[PDB]
Every structure is written in structure tokens, then in C-alpha cells.
Amino acid sequence: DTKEQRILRYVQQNAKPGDPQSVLEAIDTYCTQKEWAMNVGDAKGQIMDAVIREYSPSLVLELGAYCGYSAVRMARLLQPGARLLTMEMNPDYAAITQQMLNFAGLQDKVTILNGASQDLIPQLKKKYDVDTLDMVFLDHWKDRYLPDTLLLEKCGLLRKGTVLLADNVIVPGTPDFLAYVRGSSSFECTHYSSYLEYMKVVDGLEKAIYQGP
Numbered sequence: 001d002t003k004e005q006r007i008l009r010y011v012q013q014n015a016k017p018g019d020p021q022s023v024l025e026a027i028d029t030y031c032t033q034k035e036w037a038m039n040v041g042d043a044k045g046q047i048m049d050a051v052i053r054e055y056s057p058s059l060v061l062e063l064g065a066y067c068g069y070s071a072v073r074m075a076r077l078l079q080p081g082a083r084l085l086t087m088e089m090n091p092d093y094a095a096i097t098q099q100m101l102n103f104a105g106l107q108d109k110v111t112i113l114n115g116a117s118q119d120l121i122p123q124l125k126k127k128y129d130v131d132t133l134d135m136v137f138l139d140h141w142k143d144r145y146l147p148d149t150l151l152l153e154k155c156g157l158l159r160k161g162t163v164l165l166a167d168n169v170i171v172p173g174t175p176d177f178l179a180y181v182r183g184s185s186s187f188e189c190t191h192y193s194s195y196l197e198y199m200k201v202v203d204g205l206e207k208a209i210y211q212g213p
């Protein structure tokens with residue numbers, strides 16, 4: 001029995017079916033009162049909410065679903081017709097994410113893609129009929145933010161005004177990612193200082209808006 005299974009079970013027993021906000025609240029309560037887990041959390045979540053509301057993206061890609069917290073958080077704020085694609089390499093977590101989305105009633109807005117980002121990203125145009133992405137949320141292995149950003153560019157999946165939003169740029173940190181988006185004339189960057197999920201360690205998100213090549 002895993003921590004991730006316990007979190008799902010807690011949501012299933014306590015949250016309100018088909019109520020995404022109640023699902024987020026139940027996850028936050030579990031992590032506040034029981035076991036910590038690497039969800040973006042409430043504090044950084046408020047920033048994520050503001051970005052989704054501001055830019056109203058039609059197609060979002062999330063890298064790293066884990067238990068589905070960020071998928072629920074983003075999908076609940078998408079406009080009618082808008083869609084989220086979330087990539088997750090670990091099939092146990094992909095199964096948990098699907099059950100979370102099902103409970104939240106968000107399953108028709110979200111598609112879980114099984115596998116590693118480096119293998120799925122190059123298939124998005126052909127296999128999954130994507131032209132370009134409006135937003136990308138990065139929250140997977142921290143040394144893969146830079147390589148995947150470069151792969152997204154190479155594959156032609158970013159357009160002028162595509163918003164990249166990256167978690168954990170301070171803790172654990174994504175220093176190479178930051179040096180790249182901040183140094184590159186291809187991105188205009190904003191830093192959002194906040195706190196690591198479920199504690200008071202300073203962490204932040206970076207918003208990097210693609211400008212074209």
C-alpha cells in the first residue's frame with residue numbers, strides 16, 4: 001500500500017464527488033495532517049490559478065502528473081472546449097491520476113499520456129493532433145526541464161505567447177532551466193516567489209513566455 005494510494009483513498013472517502021475544489025482541499029488536508037507529498041500545494045497553486053485565469057489557454061501540456069493535483073487544479077479553471085494533456089511515466093501514478101480526475105468529474109477535459117516526456121513530445125503532432133501549445137506546466141524531474149524545453153522548441157510545439165510555467169525553480173531548484181529562459185532572447189520571464197508545498201520554505205515558479213525563434 002503506497003502513500004499515493006492513501007491520498008487517493010482519503011479523497012475518495014472525504015471529498016465531494018464531481019467537485020474539483022473539494023478534491024484539492026482534501027489532498028491539502030491529508031498532506032497538512034498526515035504525510036507530505038510533492039503536490040504544487042495551495043500557495044503556489046494560487047499563482048497557477050492566476051496564470052490559467054489570465055491567459056485562458058485552449059491547450060495545456062503538463063509534464064509530470066504524479067497524483068493529479070495540478071491536473072485537477074488547472075483543468076477546473078479551463079474554459080469550455082479547452083483541454084489538458086498530462087504526461088506521466090510511472091503507470092502507478094498515471095492510474096492514481098486517472099482515478100483523481102474521474103472523481104473530480106474532469107475526465108473529459110484531460111488526457112493522460114503514458115510514458116516519458118522525451119518519447120511523447122515528438123509524437124504530439126502526428127499521434128495526438130497538436131499544432132501548437134498555449135501553455136506548458138513543468139513539474140517533473142528537475143534536470144529535465146531544460147532538455148524538454150529545447151525539445152518542445154525543436155518539435156515546433158511552441159508559438160509566440162506560449163506560456164511556460166515551471167515549479168520548484170528555487171527548491172529543489174532548476175538552475176540550468178532558469179539560466180536558459182532568462183538568458184535567451186526567445187523568452188520573457190517573470191519570477192513568482194512563494195512557498196514550498198505544505199511548509200514555509202521559500203520556493204517559486206518561473207513564467208517564461210516564448211517569443212518565437
Ligand SMILES: CCNc1ncnc2c1ncn2[C@@H]1O[C@H](/C=C/CNC(=O)c2cc(-c3ccc(F)cc3)cc(O)c2O)[C@@H](O)[C@H]1O
Nearest residue numbers: 038064066087088089090093115116117139140141144172
Ligand atoms: C524523464 C523525464 N520525463 C518525464 N516524463 C513523464 N513523467 C515524468 C518524467 N520525469 C518525472 N516524471 C513523473 O513526474 C513526477 C515527478 C516529479 C518530480 N518532483 C520533485 O522531485 C519535487 C520535489 C520536491 C521536493 C522539495 C524539497 C525537498 F526537500 C524534497 C522534495 C518538491 C516538488 O514540488 C517536486 O515537484 C512523478 O509523477 C514522475 O513519475
Ligand SMILES: [Cl-]
Nearest residue numbers: 041042043198
Ligand atoms: Cl501549501
Ligand SMILES: [Cl-]
Nearest residue numbers: 055160161162
Ligand atoms: Cl495569446
Ligand SMILES: [Mg+2]
Nearest residue numbers: 038139167168
Ligand atoms: Mg513540484
